[PDB]
Design a protein around this nucleic acid. Structure first.
Length: 77
DNA sequence: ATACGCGGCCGCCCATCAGAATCCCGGTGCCGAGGCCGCTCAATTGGTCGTAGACAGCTCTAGCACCGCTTAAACGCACGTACGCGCT
């Protein structure tokens, strides 16, 4: 569980309400979701850079829950 | 022959001496810690040897985790029958 949580913290239950130190909002949840790990900020910056030109980017992940997390992050954007 | 007197009897309030009954102080029997104790045989003391078992090294099973194709089993709801249970 530490090896799986060594890159993304959102893997348990008491983790989303701990970061949210205020009040349903939508931009604050995604803002607190991207800034929780460096791979999300750098992934969004490189994704925007690739979107400024036009390429087909793929994401290969091992954890099946992280795919759903990306399913909840990329759908809002 | 005819009229007066009275006599113990008695209800009356009023007086004296013993007996009954409550309170002020009590002895008695039962229970449970104490003490005494003493002959003594089981624990303690001082001591040796050796062996279980702690411990560190090691390797080598199996318990975990994880995933996805497949599907039997669980789910929830709709409808009515045949019991739970209440009464007499």
């Amino acid at each position: 569980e530490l090896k799986k949580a060594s890159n993304h913290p959102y893997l348990f239950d008491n983790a989303e309400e701990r970061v949210l130190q205020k009040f349903m909002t939508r931009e604050n949840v995604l803002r607190g979701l991207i800034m929780s790990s460096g791979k999300m900020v750098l992934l969004d910056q490189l994704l925007t850079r690739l979107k400024k030109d036009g390429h087909r980017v793929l994401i290969f992940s091992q954890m099946v829950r992280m795919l759903d997390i990306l399913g909840d992050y990329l759908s809002i954007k």
